[PDB]
Design a protein around this ligand. Sequence first.
Ligand code: NA
Ligand SMILES: [Zn+2]
Length: 212
Amino acid sequence: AGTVMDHDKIAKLPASGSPLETKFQPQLHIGNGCHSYPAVDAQGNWSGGLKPTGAPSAACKDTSKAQTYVRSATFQGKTALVYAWYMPKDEISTGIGHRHDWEGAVVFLNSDTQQIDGVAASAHGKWRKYPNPGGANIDDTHVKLQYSAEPVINSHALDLTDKGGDLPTLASWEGMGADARAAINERSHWGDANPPIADSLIGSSLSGAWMW
Ligand code: NA
Ligand SMILES: [Zn+2]
C-alpha cells in the first residue's frame, strides 16, 4: 500500500496531460520559495513535505523534481482546466509557515473557440481572477504565473506575471491512476495545505474561480 516517503525520494508521475491540457498549462515562474515537487507517485505514496525551518527554498530547489497536475471539468458552459502545483513547504521565514503547499490555477476556455475566457490563480484560500488575459501575460497559449511569498497573507501565492516560467511534467487526474488520485484526495496527508483538484475541493475551486 502507499506510505509517506521523503519529499526528495518520491518518484514523479509521467506526463499524461491531454493535448488540450498540455496546450493551456500555465507557465510557472518561481519568484522565491520552493520549486514544484511530486506530491504523490503512481503507487499512491505521498510526500512527507518539509518542516518550514531553514531557508525558504532549502532542500526544495531541485528542478528535476518539477511536476504540474491538471483536472478537467465542464462547468457552466466552459471547459475548466484546473491545474495544481505542490511545494514541499510554504515558509515565510524560518519557523513561520507550513509543511506542504498546494497552489492552483483555473484556465477557462470558450466551449466553441477553445479561446481563454479567463484564468484564476490561488492566493491562499481566495482566487485572483483574470478575465481575458493577454499581452505580456501570455505566451502563445500559456498564461504566465509567478509563485512568491506574500507575507501579508501569511503564505505563498500565485499572481499573473510577465516573466517566463516553467512547464513541468503534466500529470492529469484521469491519467495518473487510481492510487495517485486516492493519495492526493486524502486531505490529512497535507496538513494546512489543500489540493484544489481533490474530490473534496474541485467543486469549490470551480465556483471560486468563476468570474462571469
Ligand atoms: Na514564448
Ligand atoms: Zn500549518
